[PDB]
Each structure stands twice: as structure tokens, then as C-alpha cells.
Design a protein around this nucleic acid. Structure first.
Length: 236
DNA sequence: GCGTCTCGAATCTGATGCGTAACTTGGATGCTTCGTGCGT
């Protein structure tokens, strides 16, 4: 029902993957339970869970942000943020780290017409053949709409939010593509989409997640702020 | 088409007098006979 978003103001835009790597690195050894809980690890092992992650990372314009889902997510972010703040203060002795703590109510109500919803970061590259299928809407709609529907239903079930039984979505398109890597020296990269616009006949309150593999910082979007239509101020 | 943070706090939180007076303060009755005269 409640989503907690915490932003650490480091002063520079850090990509979410390196952010998660470094926050893992800072908490090595001290308070192992916090590390296991924050990294989405099975108790007793360091492996991650295939299930939807309750721990969330995102790329803030001024830094990186922690997102908790549900009471468990809220509780973990609440007892976690002082520790990561202390670690960041320890590592960066000559910079002030600022913490912004804001909560979003999560609500999804139906609506007999559609609204323009978009995201900056979709994980859509599965096969190279499907990548060229985006020229025709009909061929590429099936897997994209299926991905959106499954992502929405699984995140709703994870957060326990009621959703209508009659959601239909049609895709519009994206702005461009981008490449992302595990490490700067890694030779493995994936393709995402920026401005992937799709129309849904329902309202989405608060911040929302779509796609899969979200903990590394993909598929987060504030649907509520997008409805304000502040995307007009994009020019040079 | 909701946006969110903030979404108070401390302290006082009754004092003082006045907080009865005067007067009434019981009274009365509870038996028959006898003589003389009316009296209907």
C-alpha cells in the first residue's frame, strides 16, 4: 500500500548498477543480516532471488535512490538508511550526503479510456530477431504487451494491491536505444528503450515498476508525476 | 487529473473572604346533682 523512496544526494548522477555494487561494498561484514536483507538473498546463502525484489534501486538525477515496497520494504529501508548513510559519510569525508525521504500511496483504479504512460528504462531485448520486429506494431505488440501485463500483475501480487480484471494495453513506441554493462571493462551489453509509451485504461498512483530485473535499476517510473505532463520542457 | 516533505511545541493546570441572624420555645375540654322555673 505504501512505497518509501529514499534519495542520497552525493552530487553526481551515478548509474544504478554501480550504486548497488558500491552500497554492497561499503557494508561488507558489518551487520550481515542487513546485507542479506538488502541484497535480496536467501537466508544462509549469498544468491539472489528470482522472485520479484522488494529492494529497489533507481538512478536519481543527483544520485541514487532506495525504494521499499510494502511494510517489509518500508521496514527494511527504515532500519537500513542510517547505516548506508554512515558508511557513505565514512567513505567520503569531504562531502555532505543528504537524504530525502518521501512516501507514495500505491493505487490502481480503472478508467474507461486510456492515458499516456511512458518509462525511461525498459528491458525489452530478448532476441535479436524481435529487435527488428518493432518496425511493424502487430508483430512486436504481443511480447511487449505480455511483458507489461505479467510485470504489472506480479508486482501487484507482491504488493497485494487489487487490480481490475479487464486491463488492455497497446504500445506506442520509444525514443531510442542505449547500451549498459556490468562493469566499464565488461564486453557484455544489453539494449533498452527510452520513452517507451504505452496506453492503459486505468490510473496508476505513486511510483510503479514494469518489466523484469528491476533491482539493478531498470523499469522504475513515476506514473503519477508523468500524468502532470511536465515532459514539455525538453529542448536546448 | 491526486505529489511528496512538514502533518508543532512549552507553560501555565487560582488566588481571598464569607463559611448567618431573630422569633416563635401551645392552648381548651372530657361532672353529675339540685333547685327553681319555664313551657311546650
Amino acid at each position: 500500500m505504501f512505497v518509501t523512496q529514499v534519495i542520497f544526494n552525493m552530487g553526481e548522477r551515478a548509474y544504478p548498477d554501480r550504486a548497488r555494487a558500491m552500497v554492497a561494498e561499503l557494508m561488507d561484514g558489518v551487520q550481515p543480516g542487513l546485507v542479506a536483507t538488502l541484497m535480496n538473498y536467501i537466508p544462509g546463502t549469498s544468491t539472489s532471488r528470482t522472485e520479484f525484489p522488494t529492494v529497489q534501486f533507481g538512478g536519481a538525477s543527483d544520485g541514487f535512490c532506495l525504494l521499499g515496497f510494502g511494510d517489509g520494504g518500508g521496514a527494511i529501508v527504515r532500519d537500513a538508511v542510517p547505516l548506508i548513510h554512515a558508511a557513505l559519510a565514512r567513505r567520503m569525508p569531504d562531502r555532505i550526503i543528504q537524504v530525502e525521504h518521501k512516501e507514495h500511496s500505491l493505487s490502481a483504479e480503472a478508467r474507461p479510456y486510456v492515458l499516456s504512460y511512458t518509462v525511461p528504462r525498459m528491458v525489452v531485448q530478448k532476441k535479436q530477431r524481435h529487435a527488428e520486429r518493432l518496425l511493424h506494431e502487430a508483430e512486436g505488440k504481443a511480447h511487449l504487451e505480455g511483458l507489461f501485463l505479467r510485470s504489472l500483475q506480479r508486482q501487484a501480487a507482491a504488493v497485494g494491491l487489487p487490480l481490475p480484471e479487464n486491463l488492455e494495453v497497446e504500445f506506442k513506441g520509444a525514443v531510442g536505444n542505449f547500451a549498459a554493462k556490468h562493469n566499464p571493462n565488461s564486453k557484455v551489453a544489453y539494449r533498452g528503450l527510452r520513452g517507451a509509451v504505452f496506453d492503459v485504461n486505468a490510473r496508476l498512483g505513486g511510483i510503479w515498476t514494469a518489466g523484469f530485473m528491476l533491482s539493478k535499476g531498470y523499469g522504475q517510473f513515476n506514473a503519477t508525476h508523468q500524468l502532470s505532463g511536465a515532459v514539455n520542457a525538453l529542448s536546448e
